[PDB]
Every structure is written in structure tokens, then in C-alpha cells.
Amino acid sequence: DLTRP
Amino acid sequence: DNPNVLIDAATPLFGLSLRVNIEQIYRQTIEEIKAIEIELTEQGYEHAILMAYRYILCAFLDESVMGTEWGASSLWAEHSMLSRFHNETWGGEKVFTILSRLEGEPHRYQALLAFIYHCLILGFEGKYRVMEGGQAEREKVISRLHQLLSSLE
Numbered sequence: 517d518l519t520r521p
Numbered sequence: 522d523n524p525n526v527l528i529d530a531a532t533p534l535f536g537l538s539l540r541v542n543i544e545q546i547y548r549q550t551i552e553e554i555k556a557i558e559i560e561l562t563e564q565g566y567e568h569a570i571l572m573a574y575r576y577i578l579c580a581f582l583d584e585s586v587m588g589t590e591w592g593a594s595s596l597w598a599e600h601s602m603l604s605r606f607h608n609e610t611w612g613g614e615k616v617f618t619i620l621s622r623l624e625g626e627p628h629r630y631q632a633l634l635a636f637i638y639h640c641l642i643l644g645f646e647g648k649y650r651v652m653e654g655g656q657a658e659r660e661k662v663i664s665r666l667h668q669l670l671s672s673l674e
Contacts, residue, residue: 518573518619519607 524673527574527636530557534578535643538585547597550582554602573619574633579603580612580647581640613647617662624669631673638666 534553537546554575561571579602586592586601603612620637623630641663649659 518569518622519576519615521618 522632524631524635524670527561527632528639530561531578531636534582535639538582539643541585541589543591543595543597550602551605554578554582554606570630570633573623574636576603576607576609576612577616577619577633577637577640579606580616581643581645583612584645584647584650613650616645616647620662620666627669627673631670634666634673635670638663638670641666 534550534557537550537553557578558571558575561574562568583597583601583603586595586597592598601610603609609615616637620634623633623637627634641659646655646659649655649662652658
């Protein structure tokens, strides 16, 4: 997941 | 594949973004974001990459609309693209977080990097819009990203 934090 | 594939897929939304029946454009934009996702999935693009792409697209379009005079007080501000697709409300910081991660593996993510560069030179500011010294700092981001894209040949 690149869209985490 | 070609490094321009994600830019190519987004061209209708770039045009749409550049000219911003408000209700109408809002709905066509939701439909088009999803249609683009489906098209790229059919072409075999990775889900994680497509979610990062979609996130950035949403933040880009939202910023375009919030830049206008009617934006912050419209239906778009009430339920933005980023809110509907990613359940987040701004995206101005996270776009650059995503950029930093992609730059950890730049050959793999060349097409998304090229897409982000195109968004930046089309005027996307995110967190730099409200940052002290933000215009100069954003230009440093653009220069670094151009250099990276150049080094990927």
C-alpha cells in the first residue's frame, strides 16, 4: 500500500 | 511499458480540470475516475499502483476545484473526489509522501513518477500552497523530479 500514512 | 501511459489515461481529466452543470461535471468526474481505473486494470496494471494513481488524481482534481471562486462553497467541497474514493479530505501532504516512496523504487514506478511530474508542472501545489517559502521549495521538488526522470533515461 503506497497510500499508507 | 511506456512511461506516459498514466498521463495518457488521465488526459480527459486534465482537460476537465483545466477549464473548471456544476453537479454535472462533478458526476462525470466521478464516473471518469472509475472508468480510467477499470481501463487500466484491464490492461494489467497493479492494484497498489492504481490506488496511488487514483489518490493523486483525486487530490489534483480537488485542488483544481478548490482554487476557483465557487469551489469551497459547492457540492464538491462537501464531498470531494478524495473523500469518495479514498476517505481522506485534503491530500496535499500525502501526494508528496507517495512521491517519496515511489522514488525509493524509481525504475519500477517510472510511469507514476512521470505522471506526478506532469501534475506538478500543471500547477499542483498541495502542501506547498500554504507553506512559508512554499513556491521556492516546490520548484526544488520539480527540479529534483525532472533530474530523476532524466536519469531513468
